[PDB]
Amino acid sequence: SMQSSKRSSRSVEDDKEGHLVCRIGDWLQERYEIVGNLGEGTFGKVVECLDHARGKSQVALKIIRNVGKYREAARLEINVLKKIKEKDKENKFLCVLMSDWFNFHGHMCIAFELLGKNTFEFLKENNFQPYPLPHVRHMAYQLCHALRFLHENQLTHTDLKPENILFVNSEFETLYNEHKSCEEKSVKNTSIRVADFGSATFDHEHHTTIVATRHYRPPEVILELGWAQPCDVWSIGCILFEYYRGFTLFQTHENREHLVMMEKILGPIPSHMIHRTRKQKYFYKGGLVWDENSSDGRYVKENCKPLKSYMLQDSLEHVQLFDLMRRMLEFDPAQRITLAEALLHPFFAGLTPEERSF
Numbered sequence: 001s002m003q004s005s006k007r008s009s010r011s012v013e014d015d016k017e018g019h020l021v022c023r024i025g026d027w028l029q030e031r032y033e034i035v036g037n038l039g040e041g042t043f044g045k046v047v048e049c050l051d052h053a054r055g056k057s058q059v060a061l062k063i064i065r066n067v068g069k070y071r072e073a074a075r076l077e078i079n080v081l082k083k084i085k086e087k088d089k090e091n092k093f094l095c096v097l098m099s100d101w102f103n104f105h106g107h108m109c110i111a112f113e114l115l116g117k118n119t120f121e122f123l124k125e126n127n128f129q130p131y132p133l134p135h136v137r138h139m140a141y142q143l144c145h146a147l148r149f150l151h152e153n154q155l156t157h158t159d160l161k162p163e164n165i166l167f168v169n170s171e172f173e174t175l176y177n178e179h180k181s182c183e184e185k186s187v188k189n190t191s192i193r194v195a196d197f198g199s200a201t202f203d204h205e206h207h208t209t210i211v212a213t214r215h216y217r218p219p220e221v222i223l224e225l226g227w228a229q230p231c232d233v234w235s236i237g238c239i240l241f242e243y244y245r246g247f248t249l250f251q252t253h254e255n256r257e258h259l260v261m262m263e264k265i266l267g268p269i270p271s272h273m274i275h276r277t278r279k280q281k282y283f284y285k286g287g288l289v290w291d292e293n294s295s296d297g298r299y300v301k302e303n304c305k306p307l308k309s310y311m312l313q314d315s316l317e318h319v320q321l322f323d324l325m326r327r328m329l330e331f332d333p334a335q336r337i338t339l340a341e342a343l344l345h346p347f348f349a350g351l352t353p354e355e356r357s358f
């Protein structure tokens, strides 16, 4: 401790952007001691703290800028994290646990129990070599379990992506791959938690038009047809593909190209979704407008193949993963598999009793 807790907690000022001026060794609430930097953003900063009222246990503390639009968004996030904590008092459903929140001189602060690396960071540090199928299976099972509980409590996350899924502990072992003739990092424990509820929407609330990060965004969002819980199911199917291959299913940044890639990989969009959309400019006599011969057309033709073509092995457990991913990636959100149904899919017969029982 370079600093004393009472003195440090009262010595306070903001910068011109409305960030809290702070550094390692500072205190908040005479309770939280800053020991590391974890992230910065337009919203504020994230620091690692020791919680001196709970045995110096480690927390991630979000410190939101002293700016009204960020303060208000944080207040809405806190109200969602409160409703989740209230419905899962014993944390069986694998959501990040908000341990505390407070207003620090205009800065909204949100504490979470400290976890390991996110699932994107781990993949990146493994040179984008994919997770082995048993790890994909256990992670898929935890995602279905976590989001089924939110969905059955009238909530949709809307922004599921590998960066928002955190390992409880990301320590790995280094195994040598016979087939790759080169070494792979294998996480020792595949237990995960779902983070980032700042976009989560209840059934009765106003639904923003464009939700989810591009790669994880479903066709009903792109076509502006309305969205609900099935939006999260599509995102999970994209995430599973990415854990299994190490690259994104939809490598695009434009709506028309994205819908074309969905057709190349998944088959035709249902005609009723095309009929209903305002985005008629994407279509001609009911078909997507697309030049197969342009530079983008040649890229998509070479790179975007039917989903089953991406299987790495053709044993039944690989067939079962691909069947479940195809059901998560149904175009029509009303026919898309629900997470209550996904938990009964035969893919999950391959779990160990320990993985199944949590």
Ligand SMILES: O=C(O)c1ccc2cc1OCCOCCNc1ccn3ncc-2c3n1
Binding pocket: 038, 039, 046, 060, 062, 096, 112, 113, 114, 115, 116, 166, 195, 196, 197
């Ligand atoms: O928004 C949430 O719900 C959220 C929940 C938990 C954590 C962070 C969060 O958001 C801030 C992300 O930026 C910091 C990234 N690094 C780390 C590192 C270790 N942990 N352990 C928990 C979190 C964490 N974040």
Ligand code: NA
Binding pocket: 007, 008, 009, 010, 011, 012, 026, 027
């Ligand atoms: Na201070």
Ligand code: NA
Binding pocket: 154, 155, 156, 201, 202, 203, 204, 228, 229
């Ligand atoms: Na909802």
